[PDB]
Design a protein around this ligand. Sequence first.
Ligand SMILES: COC[C@@H](C)c1nc2cc(-c3noc(=O)[nH]3)nc(-c3cncc(Cl)c3)c2n1[C@H](C)[C@H]1CC[C@H](C)CC1
Length: 96
Amino acid sequence: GSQIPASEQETLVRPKPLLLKLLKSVGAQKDTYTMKEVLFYLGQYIMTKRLYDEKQQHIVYCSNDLLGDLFGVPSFSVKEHRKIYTMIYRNLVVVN
Ligand SMILES: COC[C@@H](C)c1nc2cc(-c3noc(=O)[nH]3)nc(-c3cncc(Cl)c3)c2n1[C@H](C)[C@H]1CC[C@H](C)CC1
């Protein structure tokens, strides 16, 4: 949560095909993204599709959704910051 450095938002990534499919439904297509962008587009995907129950323990429900196949989970909490970064990282390649 608070032990995640700000520098993490600047990491450059090439999404794997399924994460890219998902990103293409909410943002401009491109080869390389920042982590800031991947987080904003994933957030926008979830909110637009009404996958997130805010006043219900802050859980994203994704078992009826491609997001679920991407993450390998039926649901998760937006408070599980390290978990989320990990599930995202497994769906992309870091570039440098
Ligand atoms: C449903 O998402 C809507 C979006 C606007 C959002 N609402 C958050 C609430 C909290 C929060 N955290 O603690 C609390 O109590 N609420 N945190 C985040 C957060 C922000 N940056 C890094 C991470 Cl891993 C988490 C939130 N997001 C970020 C943009 C979204 C979270 C889900 C992942 C897959 C994409 C990114």
